[PDB]
Scaffold this active site. Structure first.
Site, PDB file in Angstrom:
ATOM      1  N   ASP A 101      34.693  29.967  36.472  1.00 24.92           N
ATOM      2  CA  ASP A 101      35.084  31.385  36.372  1.00 24.92           C
ATOM      3  C   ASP A 101      36.548  31.510  35.982  1.00 24.92           C
ATOM      4  O   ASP A 101      36.893  32.565  35.412  1.00 24.92           O
ATOM      5  CB  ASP A 101      34.908  32.089  37.705  1.00 24.92           C
TER       6      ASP A 101
ATOM      7  N   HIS B 285      35.639  41.251  31.495  1.00 31.50           N
ATOM      8  CA  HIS B 285      34.401  40.895  32.227  1.00 31.50           C
ATOM      9  C   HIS B 285      33.150  41.286  31.436  1.00 31.50           C
ATOM     10  O   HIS B 285      32.318  42.032  31.909  1.00 31.50           O
ATOM     11  CB  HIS B 285      34.381  41.540  33.600  1.00 31.50           C
TER      12      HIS B 285
END
Ligand SMILES: Cn1cc(-c2ccccc2)nc1C#Cc1ccc2nc(C3CC3)c(CO)n2n1
Ligand SMILES: [Mg+2]
Ligand SMILES: [Zn+2]
EC number: 3.1.4.17
Length: 313
Positions: free
Chosen positions: A217, A68
């Protein structure tokens, strides 16, 4: 003024494709993003000196975690770029402008932990934001960087266009909470199939932009197999670190987060492709037909995970 960004030939061509990998050269990722904004939005959407200052503050506010991180921000924005370029005429000027920014910002200041671990650790962010904890934080960090001096890339928009663009960005970033994805896709399925889906209904557009956000995503499951497989190592590196931390709080983590159950990764990927990725890209392809390559690439990688199970790698 007359200052186009250009990419070497192989990138100029491959960046248009859904399965593009932005590469290992971090110093080219800002150039890639500006190139995408210019082609998607125009050379006039943003003052270049402001955009560049904004990109570099966003980069500084992503952390060095395995998955991330800044590479993910730019990967998710490239996927959104590919969707916007293959569905040119379905989106407003403001949607084009908000969504690439939303994607660059969607995981700002992520620590590599789930909303679940924040709530069980009892992290201050879990009392400030009781649901979509990290995602409300990501939006809050976006608005902070926008209000730094010299950083307001939206300076030229009217008072009311500015408010619509921050509202597109807020809903886009909230939607990256995968706990919200399941319901949002079910509703989209039903609306498309009963024929009620209406892209002039702002609440329907919201849903559709939300599904694109889930699709972008998760776009690592739509890359070439060698990209998809090495990203899985980064993803599990976070999940297992969170597992370790769960055990430190006296809690048996779910098996996905237990490094002791590494053996069962392949079978856990199947779960994920069937329960999350395939449905996501199926419903997206129905609503936006030119996104089909995302579905086909996802199905190819599911089939590569089946092969891993059958000892054929
Ligand atoms: C549901 N589950 C159960 C187990 C399991 C069970 C027993 C033993 C070992 C593992 N593993 C999973 C998993 C997963 C998962 C979750 C999010 C995610 N995002 C991506 C790419 C978009 C970045 C990938 C693909 O790598 N994933 N994959
Ligand atoms: Mg996130
Ligand atoms: Zn993300």
């Amino acid at each position: 003024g007359l200052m186009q960004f250009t990419l070497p030939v192989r990138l100029c061509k491959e960046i248009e494709l859904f399965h593009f990998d932005i590469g290992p050269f971090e110093n080219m990722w800002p150039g890639i993003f500006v190139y995408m904004v210019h082609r998607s939005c125009g050379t006039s959407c943003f003052e270049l000196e402001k955009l560049c200052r904004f990109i570099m503050s966003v980069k500084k506010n992503y952390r060095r975690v395995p998955y991330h991180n800044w590479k993910h921000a730019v990967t998710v924005a490239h996927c959104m770029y590919a969707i916007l370029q293959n569905n040119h005429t379905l989106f407003t000027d403001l949607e084009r402008k908000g969504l690439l920014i939303a994607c660059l910002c969607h995981d700002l200041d992520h620590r590599g932990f789930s909303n679940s671990y924040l709530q069980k650790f009892d992290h201050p962010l879990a009392a400030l934001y009781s649901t979509s904890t990290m995602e409300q934080h990501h939006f809050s960090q976006t608005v902070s960087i926008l209000q730094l001096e010299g950083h307001n890339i939206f300076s030229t928009l009217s008072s009311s266009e500015y408010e619509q663009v921050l509202e597109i960005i807020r809903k886009a970033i909230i939607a990256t909470d995968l706990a919200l994805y399941f319901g949002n896709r079910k509703q989209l399925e039903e609306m498309y199939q009963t024929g009620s889906l209406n892209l002039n209904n702002q609440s329907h557009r919201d849903r559709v932009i939300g599904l694109m956000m889930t699709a972008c995503d998760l776009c690592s499951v739509t890359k070439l197999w060698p990209v998809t497989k090495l990203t899985a190592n980064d993803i599990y590196a976070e999940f297992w670190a969170e597992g370790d931390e769960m055990k430190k709080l006296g809690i048996q983590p779910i098996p996905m987060m237990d490094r002791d159950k590494k053996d069962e990764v392949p079978q856990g990927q199947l779960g994920f492709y069937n329960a999350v990725a395939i449905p996501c890209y199926t419903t997206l392809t129905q609503i936006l037909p030119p996104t089909e390559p995302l579905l086909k690439a996802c199905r190819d990688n599911l089939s590569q995970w089946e092969k891993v199970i059958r000892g054929e790698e």
